[PDB]
Write a protein that binds this ligand. Structure first.
Ligand code: MG
Ligand code: MG
Ligand code: MG
Ligand code: MG
Ligand code: MG
Ligand code: MG
Lengths: 169, 169, 169, 169, 169, 169
């Protein structure tokens, strides 16, 4: 009942699962059609961004493409927001390779993020925080782990989204 | 899947979209069936009431009738509450004429609003706050504006709801 | 669209209606498919636990089986969490007999409740708080009342869930 | 270093100890000059008002006169607010007789409480909530109890404040 | 008992009075030594920044120099934070001329604001929000008003702070 | 103006600096007598406990003895609470050796922690969370680091407190 957006990949729809600041990992279950509590982070950390996925996309891992929506406020689990991809984050975990889109709200939704057009527009401190988060929030979970490969530019991210949409199309 | 209520217009159902205190304009999309983030208020203001609409009603502007639910607590976006209309607010914006119902929770739901039976039961300060809100929260948005015409009594509001229901029913 | 869980009664699904700390009694309406606001507690109290029901179960009172999910954080109304029943609470109200399951999140979801395996693992103070809550939160409501009969063990609770599931299944 | 106010008893200073909605009983210790945590309510209730005392007053019980500040927002422990007494609440506990002033913020501070000039201006539901609170929040505490005698008018309250001030000054 | 800071004007101490997001105007009273509640904004707006003053400074208006601390989190009323002035805001109100320093936390305190070195580093949207705030938050107050003259650079701000300190020193 | 408590080391006073859940490192400055914002954690973590120190104590590092107050609620910065030491945490950082007391509120203050009498009463998950926190929250800060040596029993903790008090007295 949801699509990636008429203007993909320049602007895409993101269904929020985890509000920013949260320390509870919610996960949207398309089958049952509900937001399920996967697990309460075993570490004393919290999501430094709103987390969700672009509906109508499919990655090589069989899952829709994830998005790290950067704002200074939280959104409600299950709400949809239109974002602008500004980059991509490459990483490897116990399951294998993975990539997550990094985005800010589209300009008309929140004009205070208009100057952030690419991953290099983010303060170094913010990038370090995000990287550190992914590399330590699952540590205390038996057999899990994450290692950040590197970052990608907005153009790169836009491509990943294109393929992800094509796979389902 | 929702109706205005078996006791309309004395008591009607309101599907909440924007929780009170919020500064993010959420919008319920009946098509996709989700709560979408329209935009984050460009001004440093926040909704002085829970905002939503009466399902199963239609106004001359092609949209369902809006309601300003007055309480001293927030409700969750997407939840339904039974209210008592106590008035109506008339205004004009860039799109034209508009009217919004003003209501408090029905007595059984919250007996602390039982003595507020009509618009004149609200403190002058509260009315001024609401009027000022509508006249300034969109200011910074290009080409958008709002001007309050005046207020209407509960009886007036009950009528508006009656017509709005007929149009559909 | 929801079930009690593949591992019932050892681990069951609970659809949350009232987040912990809340003083607003939300109700999930399966018909309309929405979370409605039943009422705002007339007393100055708040739910000392996340409240919800096990989907796909039926009790002698014609309603699904309730669950008191104990955690130190709130969950979003309408979200599903997997719990471990650790006990049962027996009570009688104006409508008659009633029983409510007491549970903690399943181990993988929140390993900090792993030591709590049965009702006697809960501090006496916590039990007194819960009992006192049920016996006083409806007091100010005309003709309503609740009296706690006693507590049951985890095994007892697991049985109640078994029957409740069979009735429907 | 604090006084009851230049306009006592029409408008008095109230040093807030317990923010509204709180379930932790804070107490201001004039000796040490700090806000101490007396106890965390044993019951699942919370203060339906901001609680504090009028500095520079003394009652027959050797303690300053208490005030129940009614607002729809919380104030910070240790902050001072100017209120308008609108009534008085008479009660008896394990220690003996007691009276607590009921007030709303002074008009200039919050004009939305301007219509509430006396205790009878408060909704019945609000009064019942407050009374029920005092009669049940200490129940689970060994040997403590409270019974509400009745209410007093604003004029009555203004007198109590006058005496309480004279005793000290 | 507080000073502007050993590194003034490059880094100065700011005693916070109003936490960001607040809609209650708190005021630090050096005499009584407490945080008072001046009033509750009559408009439905809230401070888009943490507000406070640099202790040990004096302006031509007889008051210490104000500071608009920009962060994406709130600080506790009465707490001190070390900031970096990045600009100054010139305005006119019913009382006359006025200037307010604009600052971000010093780098060690919060390295995510390190890239904001001057007023022109702030998004246009953020500046518009702040300006709009000052020009409308007092509107509903009888006889009050504010008009923004313009902005000043960090160097300008550093000078204002220098004078303000010498007046007292 | 504050002491460790008449019943030290069985029950001691703890002046709270950092409320639980916080991600801003507040620090009490006895000189200026204010709560200062040291820094906003560079990592996406938050204090899994209320943090503070026992007034009137001195450790070999020239600083008062720290305490990790464990509760499921936050306390206000600058407030004092009476705790029961249940253990001690040994660690080493860039500055050298360090020990921090672990405590729960005294029984009368919060009877729901009465069953936790020693460090081994805490769930393994909780201990892992605390250890992981200390070992990663300063990581992104240049030249800082922390390594946990091990835990100590309540008796051990009581001794450390005794010496720390003796040094000052
Ligand atoms: Mg993936
Ligand atoms: Mg309309
Ligand atoms: Mg039942
Ligand atoms: Mg008394
Ligand atoms: Mg000035
Ligand atoms: Mg130390």
């Amino acid at each position: 009942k949801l699509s990636p957006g008429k203007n993909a990949p320049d602007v895409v729809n993101v269904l929020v699962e985890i509000p920013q600041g949260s320390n509870i990992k919610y996960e949207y279950d398309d089958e049952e059609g509900v937001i399920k509590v996967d697990r309460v982070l075993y570490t004393s950390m919290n999501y430094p961004f709103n987390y969700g996925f672009i509906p109508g996309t499919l990655e090589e891992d069989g899952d829709p493409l994830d998005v790290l929506v950067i704002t200074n406020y939280q959104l409600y689990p299950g709400s949809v927001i239109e974002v602008r991809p500004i980059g991509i984050l490459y990483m490897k975990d116990e399951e294998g390779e993975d990539a997550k889109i990094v985005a800010v709200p589209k300009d008309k939704t929140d004009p205070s993020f208009s100057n952030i057009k690419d991953i290099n527009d983010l303060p170094q401190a913010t990038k370090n925080k995000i990287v550190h988060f992914f590399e330590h929030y699952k540590e205390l979970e038996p057999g899990k782990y994450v290692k950040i490969s590197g970052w990608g530019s907005a153009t790169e991210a836009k491509n990943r989204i294109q393929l992800a949409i094509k796979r389902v199309s």
